[PDB]
Amino acid sequence: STQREYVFIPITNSITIDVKITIGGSDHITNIDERGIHNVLVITGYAVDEKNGRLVPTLDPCDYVKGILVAGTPQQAQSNDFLTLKLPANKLYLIRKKGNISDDLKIYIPYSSPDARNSMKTKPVSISDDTIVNNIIKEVFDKIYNITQKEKVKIEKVKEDIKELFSYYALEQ
Amino acid sequence: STQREYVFIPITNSITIDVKITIGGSDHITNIDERGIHNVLVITGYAVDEKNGRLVPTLDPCDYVKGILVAGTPQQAQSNDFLTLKLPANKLYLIRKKGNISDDLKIYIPYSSPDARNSMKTKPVSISDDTIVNNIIKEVFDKIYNITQKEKVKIEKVKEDIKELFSYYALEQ
Amino acid sequence: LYEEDYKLALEAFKKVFNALTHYGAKQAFRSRARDLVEEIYNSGFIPTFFYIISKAELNSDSLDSLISLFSSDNAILRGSDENVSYSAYLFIILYYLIKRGIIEQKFLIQALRCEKTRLDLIDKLYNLAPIISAKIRTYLLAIKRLSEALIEAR
Amino acid sequence: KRVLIKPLEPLMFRSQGEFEPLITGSHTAAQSLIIPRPSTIAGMLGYILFNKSSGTGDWLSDLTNLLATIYGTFIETNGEYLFPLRMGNHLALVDQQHLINLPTLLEKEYERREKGIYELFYDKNKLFQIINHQDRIGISIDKSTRTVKEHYLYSARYLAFKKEVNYVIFIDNDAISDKINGKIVNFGGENRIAKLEVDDYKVDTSIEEEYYLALSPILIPDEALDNFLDNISDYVAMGKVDKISLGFDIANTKRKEMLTAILEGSIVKRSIIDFIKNEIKNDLRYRFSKYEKIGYNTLMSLCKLALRKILS
Amino acid sequence: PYYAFAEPFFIHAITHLHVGSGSSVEEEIDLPFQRDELGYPTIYASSLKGAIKSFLLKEFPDKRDVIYKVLGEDENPEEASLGTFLDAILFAIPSRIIEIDSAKPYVWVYVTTYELLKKVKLYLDSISQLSNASFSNLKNKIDTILAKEGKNITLDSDLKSAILNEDFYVELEALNNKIPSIINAGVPLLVLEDSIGREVINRSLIRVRRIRIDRDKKVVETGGLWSEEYVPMKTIFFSVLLGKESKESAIFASCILRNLRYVILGGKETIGKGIVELRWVKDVI
Amino acid sequence: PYYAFAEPFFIHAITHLHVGSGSSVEEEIDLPFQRDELGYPTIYASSLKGAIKSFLLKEFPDKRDVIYKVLGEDENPEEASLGTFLDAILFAIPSRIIEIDSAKPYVWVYVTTYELLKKVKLYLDSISQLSNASFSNLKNKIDTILAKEGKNITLDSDLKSAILNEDFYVELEALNNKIPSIINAGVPLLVLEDSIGREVINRSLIRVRRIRIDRDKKVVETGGLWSEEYVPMKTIFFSVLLGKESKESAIFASCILRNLRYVILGGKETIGKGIVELRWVKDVI
Amino acid sequence: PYYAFAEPFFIHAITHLHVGSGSSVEEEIDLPFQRDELGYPTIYASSLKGAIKSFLLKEFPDKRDVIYKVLGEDENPEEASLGTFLDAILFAIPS
């Protein structure tokens, strides 16, 4: 099968560039094609921790994290703090879909054991924060979709729908 | 487990009464509840032979055999020409359902090896036969339910609908 | 079925509209057309009928001015503004039982004179209570609409 | 002898073809004929009387072997008979008693002719008391969005019957009765259903008058078309001439031929009988003889229910 | 005959129904129900088949070909179908009743007319010749009722007078003395004259106004008002499923039709306007 | 499996509620309440949906896309919605009671009728078949009350006699004294016979006359009087929320529906006539 | 929150109170008091709102626009009011 990795999109750092790997071929799940960001993945029941940005397995179905699925593998500098599992494509709760997918995928999600030291209390976080929506286009949306600067340069549309399509729940602790 | 079996209703010899036994208790499936016959079972893909009446397993879904369900065990004179099978309630083809069933049924069906000497050819058979409707109500409808030939019965309904509902496909050989 | 009840509602109203000389009596009638129609179908017909006659204050020249209104067009209702209005609505109800043959016109006209017979009128309407309430609905609802439209404040 | 076709529900016999979604940004629509063409009624009985050991590429050589001879179709509400009457694109269902004075009517002076004709198709026309156009509109849903597809919407004016109505035909055969009787048929249309009923009925077989009614399309053999259309007043008193397709055959899934016909309800003069015979050649007379068996060249006397033919 | 069998059934509205017809009729309704030749609600055979075929393909996804053989094969393959639905015919519409003590008291009743019962009889005669499971126990009942045509009738109840839909006073007559009722609900069935019934029936039809609200100011939009028509709960439509002789129909009529109890017809399912119940007149008789 | 999830819920009125007229039949009250097909009060699901939708589009602004999925888009719909509302059947109405004699005296009671419990059983049976759910707990309860039909019964309490809504005298049987209450309330529930229940229920409805005063004369305006119809507090309706498999139906049923307790239905909200509480059957058991 | 501010209060009758429910057939008092759904006296929120709104409009003659937004316009109501009253429940009666 093929392997995709899930990179969330918060208003945060330690995200800046993580993948270490890109397509390799010409296959992806999330795209940016002259109209917006399609096939955005949403993982419910997980919150992200700005301290070491990665999804934390809460149980609340209301905690979700929206990110993008790119073709690749873990950075191979962590190799352990990831959820790795093989899924059909229909089993992925995707947003703004574009077409049918390969129906058999392997996903990598930046993961961290709950570490129950202190109780979890999440907050709905939006990423309007225009000074951040500017640089993440270069940080992640150009080291993966390079043509974001070249072929579909309509940044005013991809920069705008990044704010209205991505949002998450952070532990805020 | 409870024991029941299925005595079909043809215009045919050898089925005067086959069950050899009656309720034993007071639990049944089929009824005559003052409004006709209730919970009549039908078996498709099975045809009847005039000679030594029993159901032969045709492969045609158009062929069927209609009869009633009595609680008991086979003739106990051959005991091998009977397919016994444990099945839930919702699995049964039932006609004029009046109530729910136990979800646990062990049914004995008059059976025989296909005897492939001659080719099979089923034909629609109605059992109207105004003189014959009398003999089997003598033979089963009273030998199973004594109260029919007693205080309460609707002759203009029940002494009509055995000719009207029960039908099947017979080999006519 | 009740296509000629919007007609009847127009002749009955035009009678009541003219035997209401005082302006405050028209306004008082407009108050009865709205309210009385909504108790007949929540409280019932005869509970509202009792309420109507009790406020109508019969047994006068008024009770005979009604008899004239059935035929004449020069009759007038005199009395308290609250009386002429409640009595004008009693006409509306009775005008229907006459024109539709639910109550015999000869009985009703002589029951409105002979004091001893009025109790027999109320006794007749009690048994015709279910039948009446069904038929007058379209008629009374039309009277309600005509009131709100034709009876205006100066 | 006589066959009553009882529609159990609104029917549709569409002409003009092409009722299916082909163009993207456009709806489809179809009307219905008031009277089914004889090809429709022939194909229905032919569907009941079907044996595979026949035909192989004929659909009328195969069809004419089953049924003996069918006579044209009209309406019967309550024992009354109504007959198609046609004009310059007007169609009417008129009662028997009003055809008697048509030849004298069509010859009156100018102003007296128009008034008489006008009152036939408007006042004495009993069509719309008997038949309403139920303009059903259909839709195709894509299970993806669970809404309507891209313009997959169609309007089909069905044939709604305000009263009890039967279509009336006659068959020469009598061994046919106990076969097509009480039968539920799929009377041609959008998968609709009618019931069949056979009873005896005595009517004439061959007559002579100077004015006939066309109780069925009179087929013009496409070779006399020129010597016929140039002088049309010699043959048709009133009605409508147009090119029609004979239908759609089941055994081959092909649209049948297309040839000019005189539409049912027209008033054909006696000059049309001998003209056809003296114009149709035996190369095609054997063909057009079959066309008459399924019920096409059927004439009726304005006198009375007397059913003639043309080649027969 | 190629109509080996016929399976009539009653369509029982569990919720209100709305099978739409565009804007074909006048009264004031923008989205009216599907009518028939004489103005009563019907379900067209196209809508009734398509709804049951759209259903039942999600319900029995393994038997998709058995259904395609019988119900059409909506794909570009165009083998002929094996099953036909007839238009669903309004059989009985619920009506509020006030009876003058007249009875064991009822609050609602079933109301039919004689026009509606003729079309049901027409459907019933037409399939008696092929249904060797002859349901004359039901066809006769309509025959006796149609014999008593020309007056309001109550079949099993003994009322003699009532008020239907708060507006219409009718006096009722027993059939002759008694007869079993068709709908096994403990509810009387009245058969009214065609003139009086058409008013009582039109009063049971639900004609609502509906509103689209400006979410920011909570007021109705401009032109955000329209009107629709629903067929009430407990309404009963009667139709027939005709089947050609084949081996797929034997499976379809035995395996598939036994398990249809509830389906969804018409539109406005978000409002919950399609849940209906089929009753298969071969066991209720 | 036709529906992914199936959520029956009760609708307890906290204040008097008023869902607007809707219908087209002329009536005596100026602004009447939405009526059933039996004439009882009800809430059209079109009014349940529009009110609950706009409530959720406020209380869950982040999940504004899960709501647009399950409850349909607003301005430009590409696709049909996934969730359905069923019309809210009237389940029980409060009625003031003058209890003749018993150990515990009562000032008011819940009144329901057998016709209403039959509509609820119709909802429960069909939703049971069109889904994986099986509300056997309710169904076993209601199927025991519907066995005693045609006889006034009090559910648990011991009354034997009472005067409901000051005008109707009834004598009440006891059902089992062991079956638990349908809802969580110490107030008894009387299942009246449908005939006397219709009149007892019409008494619980709240007819109200309102005026618009001229500010400069402190008198009623010219024709500024109108009537109005409310459903009392503590009235219990019953509806079901249904949904098909979409991966947002699962989120809807998890967060959105498990954090819905109070909604504002109907109109006349500026005078507090809409506050209502939703009790899911998953919980009230 | 659904509501910005939620301000419950108590209404203390300084003098005798009469919010009319209008005459009615089944009352036997010509001018009765507004009743509850279970008999007790009550003040319909339509009486509260209209009385308080009319009070504010003359006590705060400069805050018209602030009152009209929260309590609804009177001439041309192009939108809904933002404030709601609840029916006054009888809390305690002097005995």
Kindly write down the DSSP assignment for every residue of chain F, as one continuous string.
--BSEEEEEEEEESS-B-----B-S--SSSBPPPB-SSS-B-B-HHHHHHHHHHHHHHH-STTHHHHHHHT--SSS-SS--SEEE--BEEEEEEEEEEE-S-SS--SEEEEEEHHHHHHHHHHHHHHHHTBS---HHHHHHHHHHGGG-SS-EESSS--S-EEETTTEEE--EE--S-SPPSSS-SS-EEEE-HHHHHHHHHHHSEEEEEEEEETTTTEEEEEEEEEEEEBPTT-EEEEEEEE-SSSSHHHIIIIIGGG--EEE-SS-GGGTTTEEEEEETTT--
3-state secondary structure of E278: strand
Beta bridge partners of F85: F241
Report the distance separating Cα E252 and Cα F26, nearest Å.
Answer: 48
Is the minimum CB–CB distance between A21 and chain F shorter than 8 Å?
no
> Cβ contact (<8 Å) for E166 and C134?
yes
**SS3 readout for F162-206:** EEECCCEEECCEECCCCCCCCCCCCCCEEEECHHHHHHHHHHHCE
Is the minimum CB–CB distance between G25 and chain C shorter than 8 Å?
yes
Report the distance separating Cα D292 and Cα D246, nearest Å.
Answer: 13
Give contacts of F210 with chain G, Cβ < 8 Å: 46
Report the distance separating Cα D46 and Cα E84, nearest Å.
Answer: 20
Name the residue among G37, G81, G87 with its Cβ closest to that of F270: G81
> Cβ contact (<8 Å) for F272 and G22?
no
> Cβ contact (<8 Å) for F22 and E209?
yes
Is the minimum CB–CB distance between E23 and chain D shorter than 8 Å?
no
Q: Which residue reads 């996804």 in tokens?
A: E61
Compute the nearest-CA separation of F15 from chain C (Å): 22
Q: Are F55 and F259 in contact (CB under 8 A)?
A: no
> Cβ contact (<8 Å) for B165 and E133?
yes
A121 phi/psi in degrees, rounded to 5:
-145, 105
Q: Are D299 and D274 in contact (CB under 8 A)?
A: no
> Cβ contact (<8 Å) for F255 and A62?
yes
Classify the phi-psi angles of F272: left when phi > 0, otherwise alpha if psi is within -120 to 50, otherwise beta: left
Give contacts of D135 with chain E, Cβ < 8 Å: 24
Report the distance separating Cα F266 and Cα D30, nearest Å.
Answer: 45
Exposure of E170 in the CB half-sphere (CA atoms within 13 A)? 27
Is the minimum CB–CB distance between B44 and chain E shorter than 8 Å?
yes
CA F229 to the chain's CA centroid:
15
Q: For an interface test with F, which of D144, D146, D148, D149 has the most F Cβ atoms less than 10 Å from its Cβ? A: D146
Give contacts of C134 with chain E, Cβ < 8 Å: 98, 163, 166-169
Helix C129-150 × helix C115-127 angle, to 10°: 100
Where residue C12 sits, what CATH number does that domain have?
1.10.520.30
Give contacts of E46 with chain D, Cβ < 8 Å: 136, 138, 190
For residue F178, give every residue at least 6 positions away whose Cβ sits within 8 Å of its Cβ, in sequence order, or none. none
Tokens matching residue F144: 């025991």
Those residues of chain E whose CB sits closer than 8 Å to some CB in chain F are 14-16, 28, 55, 58-59, 94, 96, 104-108, 203-204, 206-211, 213, 215, 218, 227, 232-234, 261-262, 264, 269-273, 275, 277
Those residues of chain F whose CB sits closer than 8 Å to some CB in chain G are 15-16, 55, 58-59, 94, 96, 107-108, 204, 206, 208-210, 213, 215, 232-234, 262, 264, 268-273, 275
- Report how far apart, in Å, the C-alpha atoms of D238 and of each of D87, D88, D107, D210 are: 6, 8, 11, 14
Which chains form contacts with chain F, at 3 or more CB pairs under 8 Å?
A, C, D, E, G
- Report how far apart, in Å, the C-alpha atoms of F276 and of each of C12, E132, F13 are: 46, 57, 4
Q: Are A83 and A108 in contact (CB under 8 A)?
A: yes
User: Do chains E and G touch, with touching meaning 3 or more CB–CB pairs less than 8 Å apart?
Assistant: yes
Report the distance separating Cα A51 and Cα A45, nearest Å.
Answer: 19
Radius of gyration of chain F from its Cα atoms, rounded to whole angstroms: 20
Name the residue among E28, E203, E271 with its Cβ closest to that of F45: E271
Give contacts of C37 with chain F, Cβ < 8 Å: 28
Q: Are B37 and B96 in contact (CB under 8 A)?
A: yes
Report the distance separating Cα D127 and Cα D6, nearest Å.
Answer: 17
Within 10 angstroms of residue D90's Cβ, the number of other Cβ atoms is 17
Compute the nearest-CA separation of C48 from chain G (Å): 6
Q: For an interface test with B, which of E248, E254, E260 has the most B Cβ atoms less than 10 Å from its Cβ? A: E254
Closest listed residue to residue A105, CA positions, set A141, A65, A69, A68: A69
For residue F263, give every residue at least 6 positions away whose Cβ sits within 8 Å of its Cβ, in sequence order, or none. F51, F52, F55, F276, F278
The sign one gets for the Cα dihedral A127, A132, A137, A138 is negative
CA D59 to the chain's CA centroid:
18
Give contacts of E216 with chain F, Cβ < 8 Å: none
For residue C34, the enclosing domain spans 3-150
Report the distance separating Cα C108 and Cα C125, nearest Å.
Answer: 11
The type of residue at D271 is S
The type of residue at D186 is N
Is the minimum CB–CB distance between E57 and chain C shorter than 8 Å?
no
Q: Are D308 and D214 in contact (CB under 8 A)?
A: no
Compute the nearest-CA separation of E99 from chain F (Å): 10
H or E element: which one contains D3?
strand D2-7
Q: Are D222 and D284 in contact (CB under 8 A)?
A: no
Number of domains in chain A: 1
The type of residue at D77 is T
Q: Are D79 and D95 in contact (CB under 8 A)?
A: no
What does this entry list as its resolution, in Å? Answer: 2.8
User: Do chains D and G touch, with touching meaning 3 or more CB–CB pairs less than 8 Å apart?
Assistant: no
Report the distance separating Cα D160 and Cα A51, nearest Å.
Answer: 75
Is the minimum CB–CB distance between C82 and chain G shorter than 8 Å?
no
Helix C81-99 × helix C5-18 angle, to 10°: 150
Report the distance separating Cα D49 and Cα D58, nearest Å.
Answer: 16
H or E element: which one contains E126?
helix E114-128
> Cβ contact (<8 Å) for F272 and G86?
yes
Name the residue among C1, C134, C138 with its Cβ closest to that of E163: C134
> Cβ contact (<8 Å) for C1 and E199?
yes
> Cβ contact (<8 Å) for E275 and F25?
no
Closest listed residue to residue E124, CA positions, set E113, E133, B126: E133
> Cβ contact (<8 Å) for F223 and C153?
yes
Compute the nearest-CA separation of G25 from chain C (Å): 6
Exposure of D224 in the CB half-sphere (CA atoms within 13 A)? 19
Q: What angle do CA D18, D20, D26 make, to 5 degrees?
A: 95
Q: For an interface test with F, which of A37, A62, A168 has the most F Cβ atoms less than 10 Å from its Cβ? A: A62
CA D293 to the chain's CA centroid:
14
The type of residue at C66 is L
DSSP 8-state code for residue E63: G
Name the residue among C30, C37, C148 with its Cβ closest to that of F28: C37
Scanning E1-91, the segments in alpha helix (DSSP H) are: 45-54, 64-71
Name the residue among F202, F222, F225 with its Cβ closest to that of C42: F202
Closest listed residue to residue E274, CA positions, set D146, D216, F73: D146
Give contacts of F233 with chain G, Cβ < 8 Å: 37
For residue B98, the enclosing domain spans 1-173
In chain G, the residue whose alpha carbon lies closest to the alpha carbon of F61 is G1
Q: Are D14 and D29 in contact (CB under 8 A)?
A: no
DSSP 8-state code for residue B148: G
Give contacts of B165 with chain E, Cβ < 8 Å: 133
Give contacts of E199 with chain F, Cβ < 8 Å: none
In chain F, the residue whose alpha carbon lies closest to the alpha carbon of D144 is F79
Q: For an interface test with G, which of C31, C36, C51 has the most G Cβ atoms less than 10 Å from its Cβ? A: C51
3-state secondary structure of C145: helix
H or E element: which one contains B133?
helix B132-136
Compute the nearest-CA separation of E106 from chain D (Å): 35
Q: Are E283 and B96 in contact (CB under 8 A)?
A: yes
Q: Are E2 and E262 in contact (CB under 8 A)?
A: no
Within 10 angstroms of residue D106's Cβ, the number of other Cβ atoms is 15
